[PDB]
Design a protein around this nucleic acid. Sequence first.
RNA 1: GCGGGGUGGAGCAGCCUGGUAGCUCGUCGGGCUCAUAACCCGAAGGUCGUCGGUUCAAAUCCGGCCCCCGCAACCA
RNA 2: CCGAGGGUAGGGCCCGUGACUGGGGCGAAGUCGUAACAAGGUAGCUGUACCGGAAGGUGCGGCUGGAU
RNA 3: UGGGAGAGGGUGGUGGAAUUCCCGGAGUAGCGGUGAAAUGCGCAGAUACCGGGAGGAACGCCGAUGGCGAAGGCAGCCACCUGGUCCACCCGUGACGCUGAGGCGCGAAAGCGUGGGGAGCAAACCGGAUUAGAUACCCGGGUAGUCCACGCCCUAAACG
RNA 4: CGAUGUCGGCUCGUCGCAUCCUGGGGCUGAAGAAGGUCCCAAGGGUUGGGCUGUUCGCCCAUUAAAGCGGCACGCGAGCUG
RNA 5: GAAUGCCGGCAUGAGUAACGAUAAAGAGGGUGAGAAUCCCUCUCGCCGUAAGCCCAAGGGUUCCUACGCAAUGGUCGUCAGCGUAGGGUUAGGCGGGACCUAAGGUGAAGCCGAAAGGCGUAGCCGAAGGGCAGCCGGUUAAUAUUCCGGCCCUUCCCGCAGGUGCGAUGGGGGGACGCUCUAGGCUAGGGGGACCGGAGCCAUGGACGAGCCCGGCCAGAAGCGCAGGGUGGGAGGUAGGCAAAUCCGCCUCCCAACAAGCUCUGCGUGGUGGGGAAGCCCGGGUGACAACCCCCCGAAGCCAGGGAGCCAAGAAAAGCCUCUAAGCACAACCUGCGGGAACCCGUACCGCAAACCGACACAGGUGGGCGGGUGCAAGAGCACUCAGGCGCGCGGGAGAACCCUCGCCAAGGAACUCUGCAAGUUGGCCCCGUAACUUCGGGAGAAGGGGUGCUCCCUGGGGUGAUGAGCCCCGGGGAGCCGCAGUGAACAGGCUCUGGCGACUGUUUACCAAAAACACAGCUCUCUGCGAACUCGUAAGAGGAGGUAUAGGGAGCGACGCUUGCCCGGUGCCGGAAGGUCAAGGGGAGGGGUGCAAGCCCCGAACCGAAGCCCCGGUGAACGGCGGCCGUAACUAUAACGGUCCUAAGGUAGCGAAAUUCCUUGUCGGGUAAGUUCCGACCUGCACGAAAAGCGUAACGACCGGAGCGCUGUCUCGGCGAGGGACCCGGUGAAAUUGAACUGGCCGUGAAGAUGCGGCCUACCCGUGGCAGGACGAAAAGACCCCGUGGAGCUUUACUGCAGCC
RNA 6: GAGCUAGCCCUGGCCAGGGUGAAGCUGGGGUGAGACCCAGUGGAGGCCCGAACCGGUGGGGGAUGCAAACCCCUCGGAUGA
Lengths: 275, 48
Amino acid sequence: AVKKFKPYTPSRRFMTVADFSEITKTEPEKSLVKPLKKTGGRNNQGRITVRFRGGGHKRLYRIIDFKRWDKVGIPAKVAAIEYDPNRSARIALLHYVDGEKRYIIAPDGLQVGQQVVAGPDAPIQVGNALPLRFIPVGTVVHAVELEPKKGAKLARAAGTSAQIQGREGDYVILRLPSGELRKVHGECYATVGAVGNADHKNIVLGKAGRSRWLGRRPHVRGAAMNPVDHPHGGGEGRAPRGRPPASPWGWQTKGLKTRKRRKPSSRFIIARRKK
Amino acid sequence: MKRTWQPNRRKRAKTHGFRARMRTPGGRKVLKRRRQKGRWRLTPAVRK
RNA sequence: GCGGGGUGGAGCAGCCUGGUAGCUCGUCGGGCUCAUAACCCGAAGGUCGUCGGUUCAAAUCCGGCCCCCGCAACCA
RNA sequence: CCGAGGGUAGGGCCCGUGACUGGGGCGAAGUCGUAACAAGGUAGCUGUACCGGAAGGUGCGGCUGGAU
RNA sequence: UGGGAGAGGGUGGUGGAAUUCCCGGAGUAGCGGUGAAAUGCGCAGAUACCGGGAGGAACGCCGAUGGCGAAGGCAGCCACCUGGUCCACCCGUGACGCUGAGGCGCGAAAGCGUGGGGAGCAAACCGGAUUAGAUACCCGGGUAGUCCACGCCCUAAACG
RNA sequence: CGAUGUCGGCUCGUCGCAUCCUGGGGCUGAAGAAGGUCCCAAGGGUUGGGCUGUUCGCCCAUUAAAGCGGCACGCGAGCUG
RNA sequence: GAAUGCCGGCAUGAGUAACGAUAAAGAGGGUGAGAAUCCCUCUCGCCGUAAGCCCAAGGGUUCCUACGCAAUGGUCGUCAGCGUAGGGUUAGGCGGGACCUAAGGUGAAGCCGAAAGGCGUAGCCGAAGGGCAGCCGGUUAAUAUUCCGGCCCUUCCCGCAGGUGCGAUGGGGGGACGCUCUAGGCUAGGGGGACCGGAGCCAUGGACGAGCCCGGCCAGAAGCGCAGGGUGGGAGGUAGGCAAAUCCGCCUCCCAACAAGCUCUGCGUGGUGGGGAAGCCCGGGUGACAACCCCCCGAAGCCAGGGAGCCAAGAAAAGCCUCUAAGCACAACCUGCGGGAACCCGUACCGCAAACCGACACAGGUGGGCGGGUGCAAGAGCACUCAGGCGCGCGGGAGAACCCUCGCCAAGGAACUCUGCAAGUUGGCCCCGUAACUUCGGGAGAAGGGGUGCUCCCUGGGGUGAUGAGCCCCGGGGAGCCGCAGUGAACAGGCUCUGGCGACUGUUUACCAAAAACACAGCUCUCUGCGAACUCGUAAGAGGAGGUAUAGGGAGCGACGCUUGCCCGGUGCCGGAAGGUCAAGGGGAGGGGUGCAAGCCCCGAACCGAAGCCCCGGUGAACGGCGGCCGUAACUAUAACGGUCCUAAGGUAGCGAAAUUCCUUGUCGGGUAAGUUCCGACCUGCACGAAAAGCGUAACGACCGGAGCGCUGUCUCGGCGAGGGACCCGGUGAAAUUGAACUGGCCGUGAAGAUGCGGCCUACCCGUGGCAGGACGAAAAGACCCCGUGGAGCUUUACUGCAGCC
RNA sequence: GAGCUAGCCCUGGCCAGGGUGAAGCUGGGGUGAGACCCAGUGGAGGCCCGAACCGGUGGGGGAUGCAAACCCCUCGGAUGA
Ligand SMILES: [K+]
Ligand SMILES: [Mg+2]
Ligand SMILES: [Mg+2]
Ligand SMILES: [Mg+2]
Ligand SMILES: [Mg+2]
Ligand SMILES: [Mg+2]
Ligand SMILES: [Mg+2]
Ligand SMILES: [Mg+2]
Ligand SMILES: [Mg+2]
Ligand SMILES: [Mg+2]
Ligand SMILES: [Mg+2]
Ligand SMILES: [Mg+2]
Ligand SMILES: [Mg+2]
Ligand SMILES: [Mg+2]
Ligand SMILES: [Mg+2]
Ligand SMILES: [Mg+2]
Ligand SMILES: [Mg+2]
Ligand SMILES: [Mg+2]
Ligand SMILES: [Mg+2]
Ligand SMILES: [Mg+2]
Ligand SMILES: [Mg+2]
Ligand SMILES: [Mg+2]
Ligand SMILES: [Mg+2]
Ligand SMILES: [Mg+2]
Ligand SMILES: [Mg+2]
Ligand SMILES: [Mg+2]
Ligand SMILES: [Mg+2]
Ligand SMILES: [Mg+2]
Ligand SMILES: [Mg+2]
Ligand SMILES: [Mg+2]
Ligand SMILES: [Mg+2]
Ligand SMILES: [Mg+2]
Ligand SMILES: [Mg+2]
Ligand SMILES: [Mg+2]
Ligand SMILES: [Mg+2]
Ligand SMILES: [Mg+2]
Ligand SMILES: [Mg+2]
Ligand SMILES: [Mg+2]
Ligand SMILES: [Mg+2]
Ligand SMILES: [Mg+2]
Ligand SMILES: [Mg+2]
Ligand SMILES: [Mg+2]
Ligand SMILES: [Mg+2]
Ligand SMILES: [Mg+2]
Ligand SMILES: [Mg+2]
Ligand SMILES: [Mg+2]
Ligand SMILES: [Mg+2]
Ligand SMILES: [Mg+2]
Ligand SMILES: [Mg+2]
Ligand SMILES: [Mg+2]
Ligand SMILES: [Mg+2]
Ligand SMILES: [Mg+2]
Ligand SMILES: [Mg+2]
Ligand SMILES: [Mg+2]
Ligand SMILES: [Mg+2]
Ligand SMILES: [Mg+2]
Ligand SMILES: [Mg+2]
Ligand SMILES: [Mg+2]
Ligand SMILES: [Mg+2]
Ligand SMILES: [Mg+2]
Ligand SMILES: [Mg+2]
Ligand SMILES: [Mg+2]
Ligand SMILES: [Mg+2]
Ligand SMILES: [Mg+2]
Ligand SMILES: [Mg+2]
Ligand SMILES: [Mg+2]
Ligand SMILES: [Mg+2]
Ligand SMILES: [Mg+2]
Ligand SMILES: [Mg+2]
Ligand SMILES: [Mg+2]
Ligand SMILES: [Mg+2]
Ligand SMILES: [Mg+2]
Ligand SMILES: [Mg+2]
Ligand SMILES: [Mg+2]
Ligand SMILES: [Mg+2]
Ligand SMILES: [Mg+2]
Ligand SMILES: [Mg+2]
Ligand SMILES: [Mg+2]
Ligand SMILES: [Mg+2]
Ligand SMILES: [Mg+2]
Ligand SMILES: [Mg+2]
Ligand SMILES: [Mg+2]
Ligand SMILES: [Mg+2]
Ligand SMILES: [Mg+2]
Ligand SMILES: [Mg+2]
Ligand SMILES: [Mg+2]
Ligand SMILES: [Mg+2]
Ligand SMILES: [Mg+2]
Ligand SMILES: [Mg+2]
Ligand SMILES: [Mg+2]
Ligand SMILES: [Mg+2]
Ligand SMILES: [Mg+2]
Ligand SMILES: [Mg+2]
Ligand SMILES: [Mg+2]
Ligand SMILES: [Mg+2]
Ligand SMILES: [Mg+2]
Ligand SMILES: [Mg+2]
Ligand SMILES: [Mg+2]
Ligand SMILES: [Mg+2]
Ligand SMILES: [Mg+2]
Ligand SMILES: [Mg+2]
Ligand SMILES: [Mg+2]
Ligand SMILES: [Mg+2]
Ligand SMILES: [Mg+2]
Ligand SMILES: [Mg+2]
Ligand SMILES: [Mg+2]
Ligand SMILES: [Mg+2]
Ligand SMILES: [Mg+2]
Ligand SMILES: [Mg+2]
Ligand SMILES: [Mg+2]
Ligand SMILES: [Mg+2]
Ligand SMILES: [Mg+2]
Ligand SMILES: [Mg+2]
Ligand SMILES: [Mg+2]
Ligand SMILES: [Mg+2]
Ligand SMILES: [Mg+2]
Ligand SMILES: [Mg+2]
Ligand SMILES: [Mg+2]
Ligand SMILES: [Mg+2]
Ligand SMILES: [Mg+2]
Ligand SMILES: [Mg+2]
Ligand SMILES: [Mg+2]
Ligand SMILES: [Mg+2]
Ligand SMILES: [Mg+2]
Ligand SMILES: [Mg+2]
Ligand SMILES: [Mg+2]
Ligand SMILES: [Mg+2]
Ligand SMILES: [Mg+2]
Ligand SMILES: [Mg+2]
Ligand SMILES: [Mg+2]
Ligand SMILES: [Mg+2]
Ligand SMILES: [Mg+2]
Ligand SMILES: [Mg+2]
Ligand SMILES: [Mg+2]
Ligand SMILES: [Mg+2]
Ligand SMILES: [Mg+2]
Ligand SMILES: [Mg+2]
Ligand SMILES: [Mg+2]
Ligand SMILES: [Mg+2]
Ligand SMILES: [Mg+2]
Ligand SMILES: [Mg+2]
Ligand SMILES: [Mg+2]
Ligand SMILES: [Mg+2]
Ligand SMILES: [Mg+2]
Ligand SMILES: [Mg+2]
Ligand SMILES: [Mg+2]
Ligand SMILES: [Mg+2]
Ligand SMILES: [Mg+2]
Ligand SMILES: [Mg+2]
Ligand SMILES: [Mg+2]
Ligand SMILES: [Mg+2]
Ligand SMILES: [Mg+2]
Ligand SMILES: [Mg+2]
Ligand SMILES: [Mg+2]
Ligand SMILES: [Mg+2]
Ligand SMILES: [Mg+2]
Ligand SMILES: [Mg+2]
Ligand SMILES: [Mg+2]
Ligand SMILES: [Mg+2]
Ligand SMILES: [Mg+2]
Ligand SMILES: [Mg+2]
Ligand SMILES: [Mg+2]
Ligand SMILES: [Mg+2]
Ligand SMILES: [Mg+2]
Ligand SMILES: [Mg+2]
Ligand SMILES: [Mg+2]
Ligand SMILES: [Mg+2]
Ligand SMILES: [Mg+2]
Ligand SMILES: [Mg+2]
Ligand SMILES: [Mg+2]
Ligand SMILES: [Mg+2]
Ligand SMILES: [Mg+2]
Ligand SMILES: [Mg+2]
Ligand SMILES: [Mg+2]
Ligand SMILES: [Mg+2]
Ligand SMILES: [Mg+2]
Ligand SMILES: [Mg+2]
Ligand SMILES: [Mg+2]
Ligand SMILES: [Mg+2]
Ligand SMILES: [Mg+2]
Ligand SMILES: [Mg+2]
Ligand SMILES: [Mg+2]
Ligand SMILES: [Mg+2]
Ligand SMILES: [Mg+2]
Ligand SMILES: [Mg+2]
Ligand SMILES: [Mg+2]
Ligand SMILES: [Mg+2]
Ligand SMILES: [Mg+2]
Ligand SMILES: [Mg+2]
Ligand SMILES: [Mg+2]
Ligand SMILES: [Mg+2]
Ligand SMILES: [Mg+2]
Ligand SMILES: [Mg+2]
Ligand SMILES: [Mg+2]
Ligand SMILES: [Mg+2]
Ligand SMILES: [Mg+2]
Ligand SMILES: [Mg+2]
Ligand SMILES: [Mg+2]
Ligand SMILES: [Mg+2]
Ligand SMILES: [Mg+2]
Ligand SMILES: [Mg+2]
Ligand SMILES: [Mg+2]
Ligand SMILES: [Mg+2]
Ligand SMILES: [Mg+2]
Ligand SMILES: [Mg+2]
Ligand SMILES: [Mg+2]
Ligand SMILES: [Mg+2]
Ligand SMILES: [Mg+2]
Ligand SMILES: [Mg+2]
Ligand SMILES: [Mg+2]
Ligand SMILES: [Mg+2]
Ligand SMILES: [Mg+2]
Ligand SMILES: [Mg+2]
Ligand SMILES: [Mg+2]
Ligand SMILES: [Mg+2]
Ligand SMILES: [Mg+2]
Ligand SMILES: [Mg+2]
Ligand SMILES: [Mg+2]
Ligand SMILES: [Mg+2]
Ligand SMILES: [Mg+2]
Ligand SMILES: [Mg+2]
Ligand SMILES: [Mg+2]
Ligand SMILES: [Mg+2]
Ligand SMILES: [Mg+2]
Ligand SMILES: [Mg+2]
Ligand SMILES: [Mg+2]
Ligand SMILES: [Mg+2]
Ligand SMILES: [Mg+2]
Ligand SMILES: [Mg+2]
Ligand SMILES: [Mg+2]
Ligand SMILES: [Mg+2]
Ligand SMILES: [Mg+2]
Ligand SMILES: [Mg+2]
């Protein structure tokens, strides 16, 4: 349940803040943080290569656990549920009975206190990791690897999920969040359950400053420039696009497809995204 | 108002200094050329 | 100034590529109808804006006058 | 001191009145179509939504105050 | 106190038939539709037939003139929470009742907000026909919506 | 064109007369009072305001009257802009 | 002899403008050839959240003294930041190195690139961040946390005493953190005292007084005291922290749990060492054996790494403690004491400026700390003032025009003007009060109105203390007083009604535009399944992002309310194993050149052969588009209805002479005496119209309209007054410009606007203060226009390449 | 050539004083429990007033300037993009 403010300033009318309820730990695990090089959107050459980025809020990188097959068998208790500024979802601190401490993305339904494991023998229960060839059919899962032992690369954002639609050889059929039906190896670890923090999309940034707090500098339209800068530039008064609308770099932006045709991946995609 | 020249000894040495020149291939020529013209001072006088 | 245009009562093909003027609506005559519409069978009505030229022959090609649509009329 | 009342400023109610605009009522024989009353030629009425020159139409649900 | 019926309600489950689609076989010159047609689809392999897959909505027979609820209303099956009825014994209290301006609550459908979902159907809409016309009636498409949760709306031939 | 600053306003004016007024006459379809019309006359005078950037124009209230023009459509090394 | 030629020299303008803030001056006494300008005194003025003081950067001897005065100093110069000389900067503790890391930089390894070079993990460098040991006073012409004095502390080496499994670039802990609000206790710093010291003073009518004027503290180890931070203890197990591990982590039982103890800091005390005014006498001497006390106010600073709440979720490594390994356990480390050793660099002076950046001793710009008192609601505002520093490096006169800045005005009150431009009004605080509309927050300081000083009388609570006095802080009631006036000076809203545009706070054309433009939360389209798309790069490699479709990119619109209609023929994009065209290649029917031939050589039809274009279907919050003629109603007029040609389809809702309406000041109503503007309506909309979005909308605006109240020098219509210039005297002394000049009016003429030609008229020679009509005045080789087969930016279905992609 | 300017990165610093009074919390009214109302507290915010500081609205001055963008009066933001 998102939390609204009363309109005691012009921008408070629509601003909404997360209710933060399921958070239990109000400071990170010092053991498990490293600094975070804020790029501002510039590469090694120093050139900007992503626009309208920077001057946000400082933040430390909460290390996260995208393998979990690191320790096959060793259980772990749900210590706390914490606020990460580095991703949409929430992070959960786990205390392994190994004594080891790790952070994972908190699925929905996880409560502080439960024990979670990872492996071929794991119970089909939220928080647990298992290779995909061992998860039941049609069980919604998240934090899905893409290739065996290469790291959890899929469904890692707030309120995402992925049902397991079928089985075919050493590969399982995956409805990715987008809708793309895809083959993924059965030997890819995944965590049963939908990601928590579902109420994220309903957050209303509320005012321009709060955008900047996120490292989000103002976006300026091509229609507001000159021809030097952008195809949409120029004109006397306002002016329509006057050509198929383009990126600043020329390529057309409406409906123009750009997945590389000869990508070897295609040989495992079944049904390109929906809607 | 605020003018263009706002002196800074660290900046002046770290930009036009001898060392800042002897690394880039261009910088060396600048020294070479200033040694050909008999420039008394191949680089600015930074007090350090 | 540049472009298109005027043809039975209404609105339009035929002009480029000369000889043949045509489609719908309406007008008239007769049918079904108690009667009107509709609907059916018929028939009428156009010297093609105007004057001159080309031609064996001009709505059709050219020129002039008339009149109607459209575009332009900017720089200080 | 109070005080008829005079004046300054801001309020509430009511009556008249207004370019123009909304429909309503009536008006011996005006124009369009033909929705309703026969299963009125798609049974009707209805709350509601959208739409159409107009009566109306359609959709979702509901009533018989509908016929064989 | 013991007893019975029942689609009364709320949540979590789940089964099968069918429609639509997707992939594969097999196969060919039509399919579809109507008052009769055309639009539409189909030799770029449709329809009809077999297998696998995706998903949603609605529950055939039972089912009836039936049962239930105060009304609006409620129907596959399973489980948990729960309301009002009715029967029997004459056990308990001892007029404690009837009603009800106000108030409060519930309130089909449509509609609205925020999200999901979307097979079938279908306001608006487009096309084909009919027609003098046809902004309709019929046919081919088809968007909201119809559906899950949450918050409004509070109307009715809400009727016996 | 190795630069003659463009409208309108303000300020200061000055000249022309094809006279708005005032002075003097003829004619009048001049009874009187009041006009129409031409003749002479440039000495002086010719208002305040609403609208619009405006010139101009219309309009309100007066007036003897609310003239019209030229001077780089007078006047920015005087202002305004 | 001319090139707005080049270099230099010298004129003109001209003894002209100006002499750099309107904070301000006067006299006396010195010095010296010379004095408004130097030194001293006395008076007078200005700065005092500064114009005072202490740091940093930068400047680089400007510091001090002595002797100078050509030049620099806007005048003068005996003076100086100027010339000459000699002097002057003292550290184990302050700053920076022999410490650590940050962005970044560099870079064994490794990767890449025609060469040059480009990347890169570890590592190394890299601070105004971490870390680390000096405080008070005196002294010097000039240095001082540096020298001296007093009291303290740091680390390295060596020996000695006690203790301990010692030992690390290896594991662990810690270092270690945000924003706002804020407790308790202190200190800095202040105010007062009838108390303590103080050289003194009694004026001019009064005063020998609890009178006046001055001062009343600074540092400090141990110990304690106060206030805080930090911190649980034991055992057993133990697969984790890449070896080891007694450390840490994890689980369990034990007690202990506001606490208390250990530990660290701040404050107080404290051996002890310092200071010490006015006033008087020639920086010093006294005062003085100075006293050194109490109450109050009180931090934004200190205990600190405190607390609480919030969301945007807030550096690293080291010193440091801990655990172990190799080793070694003669050792080694720890705690305590003693001695010994402790290096390199900076240190002067300016430092909101006359020493820095601005060509200048330039009204400009420059980060950090302290910044006292009184009153004013508070404060860093305002006025005054201490300390401290100044009077801005030309002055003396005069009392014209005019200009700047300022003051006041009779009757009128926006009649001014494009516009109330400007200037008035209003002003703080307290209480009374306060509309449409609304998104219920607001509009709102709405509007408007009353109050305000001082005397006395009674009384309400609060901090401190003690519950009392005293100091202090908010108040209340009544009775009086003076003036024209009590926020008596200074600082401090004018308001209302009504339109457009943009939701709003924001951003912007540095140096003519701050707006209606940009942005903006928010809506939609779309791309992208991760070695993502996309961006920079030849690449390597990065960003994206240590993110993963609730995400990331691109584009359009732009809070929010109600909505966003029809057209897919063209154009894009998207889907389409058929069909057609198709390039290299395959193929080699059939020809050719040659040679005695075997051969060698060339040409070469069909037929197979990508994407791409054609062909088919989709797509509007994709580029884009939304008709014409004619007729028809019991009057006129207008057409609900019809006829017809054309399209891919013909503008729906809403709105409309509008930021759009040409004809146009359209017509009608409102307001006004009068209204091309304004508001409200009509609709033949030249030429609105639905995400280059349509119609609204509370609040908001230094945005643009319109009306009104108040008050006005805006005006009728101008008057007087002030000061700084202008004016005269002394000093100093530019500038554009300039063919040469002995440079008049007219009417004419001339390349068509004559001081210069003709004729006439007029005119003695030279200045000065004033005005701007002319010298087609100055300035700038017209920025408009054309010209040039001159250039550059920008577009595209112009041509031809290239990158990229297929 | 980024010692000016513009954006980003790293690390520090600054923002007097005064007004308004969100959620929450406590108590109380209320109910079947509620929603919710009241007072008290608390002290939110690209909130309000206004110095510093960051600006540059309107005017006047200035125009061989004190200045190759400055001066006076006035005006905007000032816990925040
Ligand atoms: K032009
Ligand atoms: Mg939640
Ligand atoms: Mg609210
Ligand atoms: Mg949350
Ligand atoms: Mg760390
Ligand atoms: Mg990053
Ligand atoms: Mg790099
Ligand atoms: Mg980018
Ligand atoms: Mg960027
Ligand atoms: Mg998170
Ligand atoms: Mg994220
Ligand atoms: Mg796989
Ligand atoms: Mg959430
Ligand atoms: Mg969002
Ligand atoms: Mg952020
Ligand atoms: Mg945006
Ligand atoms: Mg933008
Ligand atoms: Mg532009
Ligand atoms: Mg372009
Ligand atoms: Mg364009
Ligand atoms: Mg434009
Ligand atoms: Mg533009
Ligand atoms: Mg335009
Ligand atoms: Mg394009
Ligand atoms: Mg591309
Ligand atoms: Mg600047
Ligand atoms: Mg500055
Ligand atoms: Mg310079
Ligand atoms: Mg430096
Ligand atoms: Mg620097
Ligand atoms: Mg260098
Ligand atoms: Mg370099
Ligand atoms: Mg080289
Ligand atoms: Mg030399
Ligand atoms: Mg050099
Ligand atoms: Mg033809
Ligand atoms: Mg023919
Ligand atoms: Mg015919
Ligand atoms: Mg003929
Ligand atoms: Mg032009
Ligand atoms: Mg009276
Ligand atoms: Mg009918
Ligand atoms: Mg019918
Ligand atoms: Mg019917
Ligand atoms: Mg019907
Ligand atoms: Mg319909
Ligand atoms: Mg029929
Ligand atoms: Mg076919
Ligand atoms: Mg075939
Ligand atoms: Mg589907
Ligand atoms: Mg009984
Ligand atoms: Mg009894
Ligand atoms: Mg419904
Ligand atoms: Mg209802
Ligand atoms: Mg019924
Ligand atoms: Mg010219
Ligand atoms: Mg001109
Ligand atoms: Mg008469
Ligand atoms: Mg004119
Ligand atoms: Mg006119
Ligand atoms: Mg008269
Ligand atoms: Mg002229
Ligand atoms: Mg002139
Ligand atoms: Mg003219
Ligand atoms: Mg003219
Ligand atoms: Mg002139
Ligand atoms: Mg001028
Ligand atoms: Mg002028
Ligand atoms: Mg010559
Ligand atoms: Mg010259
Ligand atoms: Mg030359
Ligand atoms: Mg020269
Ligand atoms: Mg010489
Ligand atoms: Mg000379
Ligand atoms: Mg001279
Ligand atoms: Mg002279
Ligand atoms: Mg002169
Ligand atoms: Mg001057
Ligand atoms: Mg000067
Ligand atoms: Mg001044
Ligand atoms: Mg001054
Ligand atoms: Mg002054
Ligand atoms: Mg002053
Ligand atoms: Mg002497
Ligand atoms: Mg002298
Ligand atoms: Mg003197
Ligand atoms: Mg004197
Ligand atoms: Mg002087
Ligand atoms: Mg002196
Ligand atoms: Mg002060
Ligand atoms: Mg520095
Ligand atoms: Mg000298
Ligand atoms: Mg001399
Ligand atoms: Mg000499
Ligand atoms: Mg000099
Ligand atoms: Mg000077
Ligand atoms: Mg002198
Ligand atoms: Mg001299
Ligand atoms: Mg001398
Ligand atoms: Mg010295
Ligand atoms: Mg050493
Ligand atoms: Mg280092
Ligand atoms: Mg380096
Ligand atoms: Mg340092
Ligand atoms: Mg130190
Ligand atoms: Mg000390
Ligand atoms: Mg030990
Ligand atoms: Mg160690
Ligand atoms: Mg941290
Ligand atoms: Mg810090
Ligand atoms: Mg102290
Ligand atoms: Mg005080
Ligand atoms: Mg006496
Ligand atoms: Mg002490
Ligand atoms: Mg262990
Ligand atoms: Mg002395
Ligand atoms: Mg501070
Ligand atoms: Mg804290
Ligand atoms: Mg916050
Ligand atoms: Mg690091
Ligand atoms: Mg031994
Ligand atoms: Mg050394
Ligand atoms: Mg020193
Ligand atoms: Mg200053
Ligand atoms: Mg300062
Ligand atoms: Mg100085
Ligand atoms: Mg300068
Ligand atoms: Mg010079
Ligand atoms: Mg000076
Ligand atoms: Mg003081
Ligand atoms: Mg006070
Ligand atoms: Mg005050
Ligand atoms: Mg002075
Ligand atoms: Mg005089
Ligand atoms: Mg007056
Ligand atoms: Mg008045
Ligand atoms: Mg006016
Ligand atoms: Mg006037
Ligand atoms: Mg006005
Ligand atoms: Mg004004
Ligand atoms: Mg009102
Ligand atoms: Mg009110
Ligand atoms: Mg009203
Ligand atoms: Mg206020
Ligand atoms: Mg008031
Ligand atoms: Mg008030
Ligand atoms: Mg009173
Ligand atoms: Mg008094
Ligand atoms: Mg004031
Ligand atoms: Mg104010
Ligand atoms: Mg705005
Ligand atoms: Mg809005
Ligand atoms: Mg802009
Ligand atoms: Mg500008
Ligand atoms: Mg510019
Ligand atoms: Mg400029
Ligand atoms: Mg500039
Ligand atoms: Mg502008
Ligand atoms: Mg502004
Ligand atoms: Mg914008
Ligand atoms: Mg906006
Ligand atoms: Mg929106
Ligand atoms: Mg990364
Ligand atoms: Mg996103
Ligand atoms: Mg984006
Ligand atoms: Mg907006
Ligand atoms: Mg826009
Ligand atoms: Mg199309
Ligand atoms: Mg198309
Ligand atoms: Mg198409
Ligand atoms: Mg549209
Ligand atoms: Mg177009
Ligand atoms: Mg088109
Ligand atoms: Mg008629
Ligand atoms: Mg409609
Ligand atoms: Mg209109
Ligand atoms: Mg008009
Ligand atoms: Mg009008
Ligand atoms: Mg309009
Ligand atoms: Mg228009
Ligand atoms: Mg007009
Ligand atoms: Mg008019
Ligand atoms: Mg009209
Ligand atoms: Mg438009
Ligand atoms: Mg558009
Ligand atoms: Mg538009
Ligand atoms: Mg559009
Ligand atoms: Mg509203
Ligand atoms: Mg509004
Ligand atoms: Mg508005
Ligand atoms: Mg504005
Ligand atoms: Mg206007
Ligand atoms: Mg008025
Ligand atoms: Mg005056
Ligand atoms: Mg007078
Ligand atoms: Mg004067
Ligand atoms: Mg004289
Ligand atoms: Mg001189
Ligand atoms: Mg001569
Ligand atoms: Mg002539
Ligand atoms: Mg002449
Ligand atoms: Mg002459
Ligand atoms: Mg001559
Ligand atoms: Mg002569
Ligand atoms: Mg001659
Ligand atoms: Mg004469
Ligand atoms: Mg003069
Ligand atoms: Mg002149
Ligand atoms: Mg002139
Ligand atoms: Mg010139
Ligand atoms: Mg110029
Ligand atoms: Mg030239
Ligand atoms: Mg030229
Ligand atoms: Mg040419
Ligand atoms: Mg030529
Ligand atoms: Mg050319
Ligand atoms: Mg250019
Ligand atoms: Mg190339
Ligand atoms: Mg910079
Ligand atoms: Mg600098
Ligand atoms: Mg910071
Ligand atoms: Mg501040
Ligand atoms: Mg404050
Ligand atoms: Mg309150
Ligand atoms: Mg709370
Ligand atoms: Mg604020
Ligand atoms: Mg200005
Ligand atoms: Mg002003
Ligand atoms: Mg001037
Ligand atoms: Mg200038
Ligand atoms: Mg200023
Ligand atoms: Mg602001
Ligand atoms: Mg900030």
